[PDB]
C-alpha cells in the first residue's frame, strides 16, 4: 500500500513518551508507551481490584462496554523486577493513528504499585517480534504488516528534549522533518529481538568498555541507557559519579565538564555529550545531579545486554525495519 500513520507523543520529564490508542466499539482510549523491548499489548482491566494503586490512577478497559470484544481468557504473566504483572487475554479492535486492527491484548488484573502507579500512561503496545511474545500472541505490528497497507514495513521514533511536540511515532516510514542527513543501518544479530552488536563504549577519546564486543537492545520503552551492574560501575568510576540507591549522581557544577560518551554501532560512533546524559537541575556545587544512565541486569535469554533507551533515542532518530531486519539511526532535529 501507500499509507503512513503517525501518532503524537507526550514527553513526561524525559522518562516517559506516550501516545493514544483506542480499543473497542465504541473506542476506549488509553495512553500507551510504544515499546521495542516487548511484544505484547497490555492495558489495565476493569477486573483490577481498586486495592491496586496502579489500577486506581489509570483508565481501565471494560469488555462489557465493547460490542466488538471477543472472550479468550487465557492467563498471562510477566515477572517484572518489583513483582508479577498478570492478567488474561482478550481480543478487540484497536486503532493506532488511523490504522484499525483486530488484536489480542492482555488485560491486567494485578501488578506492583511501583513503578506502575508513577506511570503517567495507562498501558503498553509492544513493538517487538512474535519470538518474545508471552503466550506466542501475534504482536500488533505483525497484524499491521499482514493488512498490506503500509508504504514500507518499518516504523520510526522521534523523542524531543523537555520544554512543543514531545515525540512522534510513524508507522510505514520516517518523517524527514525530524532528522537530518541520512540513516546508517545495523543488522539485527538475529530476528526475534531488536538487538544489535556494539563494538565499544568510549569515555572521551579512548575505548573504555565493551572491548571484545557486546549487545545493545534498542528499547523505546526504557527511560535510560542501561548496562550491566559491572559495566556501569566502571563507566561511573570513569565519570567520577557517586552511587545512590536507585541512581548515580555528580555535583551539579561538574555536570557541564563531564566527558563525551560514545557508542560504536555498525560503522559510526554515536556520541552523547554531558548535555545529553546529565539532568542539570542546578549548576550549584551544593547540589547533586542525576545521570540518565543506570545499571540493569537484564536476564536471559535477551540479556546480559546494554539497553539504549530514550537517553539515546532523543539524540538519534530511530527507524525499525522489519522488511530488512535492521535498525537505522539519524541525527534528530530539535
Ligand atoms: O519497564 C518497562 C519496560 C517493559 C514493560 C512492558 C510491559 C510491562 C507490563 C505491564 C505494563 O502495563 C502498564 C504500565 F506499563 C504502566 C501502567 C499501567 F497501568 C500498566 Cl497496565 C512491564 C514492563 C518492556 C521493555 C523491557 N523492560 C524495560 C521496559 N521495556 N515499562 C515500565 C516503565 C518504564 C519507564 C517508566 C515507567 Cl513509570 C514504567 Cl511503569 C513499560 C513502559 C515500558
Ligand atoms: C486464546 O487464544 C490462543 C491463541 O494464542 C488460543 O491458543 C487459545 O485456545 C484461546 N483460548 C480459548 C480457549 O479461547
What are the boundaries of each domain within the chain?
4-174, 175-332
Please provide the size of the chain in residues. 334
Residue 79 Cα distances to 90, 181, 244, 299, angstroms: 20, 41, 25, 11
How open is the CA angle 15-186-237, to the nearest 5 degrees? 50
Domains 4-174 and 175-332 share a fold: yes
Residue with cell 568510576: 237
Solving technique: X-ray
Q: Going by DSSP bridges, is the β-strand pair 261-265/248-251 parallel, antiparallel, or unpaired?
A: unpaired
Cell digits for 139? 504482536
CA dist 126 and 297 (Å) reads 20
Cα 162 from chain centroid (whole Å): 17
| Inter-CA distances, 40 with 48, 153, 195, 279, 291, Å | 19, 19, 17, 31, 30
Please identify, in words, the CATH class of the domain defined by 4-174: mainly beta
Residue ranges of E strands in 188-273: 195-203, 206-209, 214-218, 225-227, 242-243, 248-251, 261-265, 268-272
The catalytic site residues sit at 35, 219
CA nearest neighbour of 111 among 62, 42, 23: 42
Distance of CA 160 to the CA centre of its chain: 14
Protein residue closest via CA to atom 12 of ligand 1: 123
Maximum C-alpha span of the chain = 61
Distance of CA 133 to the CA centre of its chain: 16
Instruction: Identify the nearest ligand to the CA of 120 by its number.
Output: 1
Q: Give whole-number Cα distances, 290 to 9, 165, 244, 246, 330, in Å.
A: 24, 25, 9, 10, 27
| Grid coordinates belonging to 158 | 522521534
Ligand located closest to 133 CA: 2
Q: Which residues on neighbouring strands pair with residue 33, listed in sequence order?
A: 124
Could you tell me the three cell numbers for 34? 510504544
User: Which resolution, in Å, applies to this structure?
Assistant: 2.0
Distance between CA atoms of 142 and 323, rounded to whole angstroms? 11
CA distance 47 to 45: 5
306 C-alpha to ligand 1 centroid (Å): 17
Question: Which distant-in-sequence residues (6+ apart) come within 8 Å of 125 by Cβ?
Answer: 21, 32, 33, 34, 35, 41, 96, 140
- Residue 127 and residue 125: Cα distance in Å, rounded? 6
The DSSP bridge partners found for residue 307 are 217, 226
99: number of Cβ within 10 Å: 19
Contacts of 68 (CB under 8 A, 6+ apart): 24, 25, 92, 93
The H or E element that residue 146 is part of is none
Among protein residues, the one with the nearest Cα to ligand 1's atom 7 is 124
Distance (Å, rounded) from C-alpha 34 to C-alpha 129? 13
Angle at 304 between CA 225 and CA 332, to 5 degrees: 25
Distance 71 CA to ligand 2 centre (A): 9
CATH number of 175-332: 2.40.70.10
Contact 107, 90 (CB under 8 A): yes
* Contact by Cβ (8 Å): 173, 157: no
Cα(137) to centroid of ligand 2, in Å? 9
Q: Write out the three cell numbers for 201.
A: 563504549
CB within 6 Å of ligand 2 — which residues? 72, 74, 89, 135-137
Q: Considering only CA atoms, give the Rg of the chain.
A: 20
Q: Closest by alpha carbon to 235, among 183, 182, 292?
A: 292
Amino acid at each position: 500500500g501507500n499509507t503512513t500513520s503517525s501518532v503524537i507523543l507526550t514527553n513526561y520529564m524525559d522518562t516517559q513518551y506516550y501516545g493514544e490508542i483506542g480499543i473497542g466499539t465504541p473506542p476506549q482510549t488509553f495512553k500507551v508507551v510504544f515499546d521495542t523491548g516487548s511484544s505484547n499489548v497490555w492495558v489495565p482491566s476493569s477486573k483490577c481490584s481498586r486495592l491496586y494503586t496502579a489500577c486506581v490512577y489509570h483508565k481501565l478497559f471494560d469488555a462489557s462496554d465493547s460490542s466488538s470484544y471477543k472472550h479468550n481468557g487465557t492467563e498471562l504473566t510477566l515477572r517484572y523486577s518489583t513483582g508479577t504483572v498478570s492478567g488474561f487475554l482478550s481480543q478487540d479492535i484497536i486503532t493506532v493513528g488511523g490504522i484499525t486492527v483486530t488484536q489480542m491484548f492482555g488485560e491486567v488484573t494485578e501488578m506492583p504499585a511501583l513503578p506502575f502507579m508513577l506511570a503517567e500512561f495507562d498501558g503498553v503496545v509492544g513493538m517487538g517480534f512474535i519470538e518474545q511474545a508471552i503466550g506466542r500472541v501475534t504482536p500488533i505490528f505483525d497484524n499491521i504488516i499482514s493488512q498490506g497497507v503500509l508504504k514500507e514495513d518499518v516504523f520510526s521514533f522521534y523523542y524531543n528534549r523537555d520544554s512543543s511536540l514531545g515525540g512522534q511515532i510513524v508507522l510505514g516510514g520516517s518523517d524527514p522533518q525530524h532528522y537530518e542527513g541520512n540513516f546508517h543501518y545495523i543488522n539485527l544479530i538475529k530476528t526475534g529481538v531488536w538487538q544489535i552488536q556494539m563494538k565499544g563504549v568510549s569515555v572521551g577519546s579512548s575505548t573504555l568498555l565493551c572491548e571484545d564486543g557486546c549487545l545493545a537492545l534498542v528499547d523505546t520503552g526504557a527511560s535510560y541507557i542501561s548496562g550491566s551492574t559491572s559495566s556501569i560501575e566502571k563507566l561511573m568510576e570513569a565519570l567520577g559519579a557517586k552511587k545512590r540507591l536507585f541512581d548515580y549522581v555528580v555535583k551539579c557544577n561538574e555536570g557541564p565538564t563531564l566527558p563525551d560518551i560514545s557508542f560504536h554501532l555498525g560503522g559510526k560512533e554515536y556520541t552523547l555529550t554531558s548535555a545529553d546524559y546529565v539532568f542539570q537541575e542546578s549548576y550549584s556545587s551544593k547540589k547533586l545531579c542525576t545521570l540518565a544512565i543506570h545499571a540493569m541486569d537484564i536476564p536471559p535469554p535477551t540479556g546480559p545486554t546494554w539497553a539504549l533507551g530514550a537517553t539515546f533515542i532523543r539524540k538519534f532518530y530511530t527507524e525499525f525495519d522489519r522488511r530488512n531486519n535492521r535498525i537505522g539511526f539519524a541525527l534528530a532535529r530539535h
